[PDB]
Amino acid sequence: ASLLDTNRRHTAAVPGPGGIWSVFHAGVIGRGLKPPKFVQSRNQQEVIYNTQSL
Amino acid sequence: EVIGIRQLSQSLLPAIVELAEDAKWRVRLAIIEYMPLLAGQLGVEFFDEKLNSLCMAWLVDHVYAIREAATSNLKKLVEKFGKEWAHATIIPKVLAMSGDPNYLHRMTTLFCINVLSEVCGQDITTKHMLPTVLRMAGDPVANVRFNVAKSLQKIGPILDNSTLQSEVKPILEKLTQDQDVDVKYFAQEALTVLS
Amino acid sequence: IFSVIHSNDPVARAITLRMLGSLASIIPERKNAHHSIRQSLDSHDNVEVEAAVFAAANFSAQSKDFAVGICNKISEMIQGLATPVDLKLKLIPILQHMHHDAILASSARQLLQQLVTSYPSTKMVIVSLHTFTLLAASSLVDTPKQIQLLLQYLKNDPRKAVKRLAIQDLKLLANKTPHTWSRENIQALCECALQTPYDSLKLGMLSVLSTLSG
Amino acid sequence: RLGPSSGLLVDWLEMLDPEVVSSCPDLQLRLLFSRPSFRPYLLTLFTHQSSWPTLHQCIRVLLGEQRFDPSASLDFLWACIHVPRIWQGRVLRVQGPELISLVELILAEAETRSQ
Amino acid sequence: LNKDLKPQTFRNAYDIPRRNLLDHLTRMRSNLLKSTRRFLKGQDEDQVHSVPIAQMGNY
Amino acid sequence: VDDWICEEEITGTDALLRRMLLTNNAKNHSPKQLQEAFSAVPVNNTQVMQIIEHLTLLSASELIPYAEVLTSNMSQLLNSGVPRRILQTVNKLWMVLNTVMPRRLWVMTVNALQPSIKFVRQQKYTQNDLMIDPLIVLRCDQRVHRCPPLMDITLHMLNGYLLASKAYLSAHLKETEQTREELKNALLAAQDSAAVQILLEICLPTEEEKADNLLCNLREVQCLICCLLHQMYIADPNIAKLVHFQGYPCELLPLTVAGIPSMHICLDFIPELIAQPELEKQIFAIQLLSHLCIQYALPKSLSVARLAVNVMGTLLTVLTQAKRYAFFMPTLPSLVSFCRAFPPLYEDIMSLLIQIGQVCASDVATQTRDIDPIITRLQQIKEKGSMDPDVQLCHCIERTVIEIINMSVS
Q1: Is F92 helix (H, G, I), strand (E, B) or coil?
Q2: Taking CB atoms and an 8 Å limit, are A4 and F194 in contact across chains?
């Protein structure tokens, strides 16, 4: 629904300079916003004893 | 002053309306600066027919000086044409800018509210503008957040005194422990000014 | 004209079907047109189905073979539970063109009786009774018991719309076949006019009786 | 007996209950599926008028206790599959006990017909 | 891909990616209708402002 | 023509019912009464029906005064629990009003189907605004996307306003004349393709819907959109070509292929689409061809499928490892469809699968792996994480071979 949502965002807040609306931005850098890339860490004790087994 | 405004509307108004969309922003700035005069010399009906949309078109301008001038111009326009006209024509198009994905336009609504609370009176500021101002405290952009703190400081005097501790104070308390140092500073400055 | 029935556009197919229905008088017993109607009747585009119903009406009016070949399919679409009520209403007047043969007319009569007993809505019973009246007028063998049925609905059915339709149909039959009216039919109509409280219905039955008296 | 007046009551039911089965569902379930000349009209109205969650609920309560006419239920299922709104411009998921009750309904219809 | 097939996204609808379809549609609409006492050029930000670096600052 | 042909006679039932039901001269059903019925806080849909059902007997000319009532008050019909009879009758009356005064009706309907969140900004669109930007009609309340009557209303308006925008653009060019024609043509093509893409996105299930698949409002909406897209592709096949060069999510491919009879023309430009340098366009061409081959099994379809298999084999030796993964993960299930449609392709498809599997086994052997499918070598049918791309592609090859075999043995 990327284009559907984009069409929703195109609702003009003001009527426009001459009754015709143009989008504010000149484009999008890259593929938009980057993902947050959330990290994950396991238990440190289990890491210690996995290292111990190895 | 020489030819009156009937001849202005007949001859020069279509030409200046064409200049409200000029490539250079100082031309548009001049047109904004000359809108209060025309407004003060024209009726609500004609201004709404021709020039109100022009006044709204500038709030979304790329240049910040144009947006600032248009915001300051809204105060004079409301002073001239009363606050019912503002509630019918000005306010809905300003509130729509609050939901905009660009933070420049959200900050523009905060500036518009800053200049509009003074002239719109206690009731309009309390029930129409304040709920929109409060919901922007959860914004992800720190700039919008500390401008919310600034706005709540500024529209504090012209709000009714009943909604201060109930509504404005919890939001400022939430903002004064925010992660951004500027949001903290402006929230605590607002907290002092609220007394 | 017929080459446009093969278009993938259902609107073009609908216009072609309507044209074929309009040209039915100069091309009855045209087998390709018959097959086109039959294929478009079970189409999934409502405009094509409506055009097929219109063309089926025209071709059943014109050609006997199409009527006998289509009566079973029309019956199964009408009685089919998947058909909406609106399309059922649109389909019932096809049965008024089943007068080409005595057995065909009798089968259509039986189907219409099944419809009036099994679909007693105001719209459905009105369309079915009008179609039954027209079929009886065209076949003029079931006309006495059609008059008896209409008088039964006029006397018994409490809906003012159904009574009004019964009055209109009896006026049509009086205009068409006054000689077929029995003494018992006129007695029943007179009794109905006597014991009805509503003045509009009474005026209608007296219009029928004044048509008969002339 | 409600011989001639059945049509008026059916019309009033159509005008009063919009979704056919919305108020007192037990009575309308008895009307649609039970041991009625006007039944196919009400079945058509229910098929082409009720909302899809209502039709799904009716399907679930039909397929789980001899309480429903097998012929009416099977015709209703076949109609629900072939609704013209579903195929405009031109296959159902069922579970274990649902399929068991479905084949039981088919067998019941066959036994009633016999040969 | 070639060097000479510079995307005339205003003049050719096949050069517009799906993700950029709506905003660029708005842009070409504005470029067409709002050209009253303006300029009817090709695509801004491509035909212009993608100058070769040698001519970038040839004041 | 759909607005005109609906005025054509069918069997005269409407005339008979009008004559026998409307002559009771109980004309109490004024638009004001309908407005009061719509405005009742404990709203009674039954009473609402008792009026609008009577309005189906009315002629289009005498249905004019009710238009503002059953248009302005029909944002309420999007609320839950509203009967489908009410919506169907509103759709019918909307069509009867569209026959007689479509332009004013469309403007009022667009202004009535606004989302109405910040409805103090009641954006009152005019005819000029909608002719400039026909995509306004698709910025309606989200509930219209699962209301098949009001979706049908919206689709009628969308088609009408796209045509109106064509006319308006030509008129504006002629006026401003005293190239630009190419700019206009590109703008109209972009507008129509954008409309098609938005409708296709409407056809997708939402995340909430993701959380029968045939008996739902979504299926009805998909059928209506497929009907409209069928009409647009018939009107201009270049729009279909542009839409498929843009592409859309592959989840809609069986939907569009089954529901749109116009797609047999897609076999004409699939060889051109395959020739594109973008990998995504070639992937979409392969998947589209697979679905079409499932639908239309024709000698031309077989020839294009042979071309597709040859292209796959060719660029198996052109793409790098990352590109190989990216191209072959979505397009490998499509090879099952070619096998289903064309048994003569068994030799070529199995040979290609053997080549891909051997290449991917070599790539697996290149580096150390967490799974190492080389040493498994004898697994049974492993019916169903962040794994290596190469082992994933190996498993995908195994799974598609299993699907090909199972289809050909059951």
Answers
A1: helix
A2: no
Cβ(B91)–Cβ(B128) below 8 Å: yes
Question: Experimental method used, please?
Answer: cryo-EM
Cα separation, B11 vs B5, in Å, equals 10
F114 close to B (CB below 8 A) = no
- Rounded distance, CA F97 to CA F91, Å? 10
Rounded distance between C-alpha atoms, residue C207 and residue C200, angstroms: 11
B175: helix, strand or coil: helix
CA proximity to C130, closest of D3, D8, F15: F15
**Burial class of residue B177 in the structure, from the number of CB atoms within 10 Å of its CB (0-12 exposed, 13-18 middle, 19+ buried):** exposed
Q: Residue A3: its chain F contacts at CB < 8 A?
A: 194, 197-198, 201
Q: What count of CB pairs under 8 Å joins B to F?
A: 13
Total residues belonging to chain E: 59
Torsion angle defined by CA atoms of residues F12, F14, F16 and F22, in that order, rounded to the nearest 10 degrees: -160
Which chains have at least 3 CB atom pairs separated by less than 8 Å from chain E? A, F
Q: Which two tokens stand for residue D77?
A: 């299922």
Interface contact flag, A6 E23, Cβ < 8 Å: yes
Closest by Cα among F164, F71, B66 to A14? B66
Contact assignment for D11 to C159 by CB distance below 8 Å: yes
Helix, strand, coil: what percent of chain A each, to 5?
Answer: 35, 0, 65
Partner chains of C (3+ C-beta pairs under 8 Å): D, F
Beta strands in chain B (DSSP E): none
Which residue pairs from C8-11 have beta carbons closer than 8 angstroms and sit at least 24 positions apart in sequence? C8/F230, C8/F234, C8/F261, C8/F262, C8/F264, C9/F230, C9/F231, C9/F234, C10/C43, C10/C45, C10/C47, C10/C48, C10/D89, C10/F230, C11/C47, C11/F1, C11/F2, C11/F5, C11/F231
Resolution of the structure, angstroms? 3.1
* CA–CA gap between residue F74 and residue F90 (Å, rounded): 8
Are D34 and D67 in contact, with CB atoms under 8 Å apart? Answer: yes
Tokens of C99: 């007068």
Q: Do E and C have ≥3 inter-chain CB pairs under 8 A?
A: no
3-class DSSP assignment, residue F100: coil
Amino acid making up residue B171: I
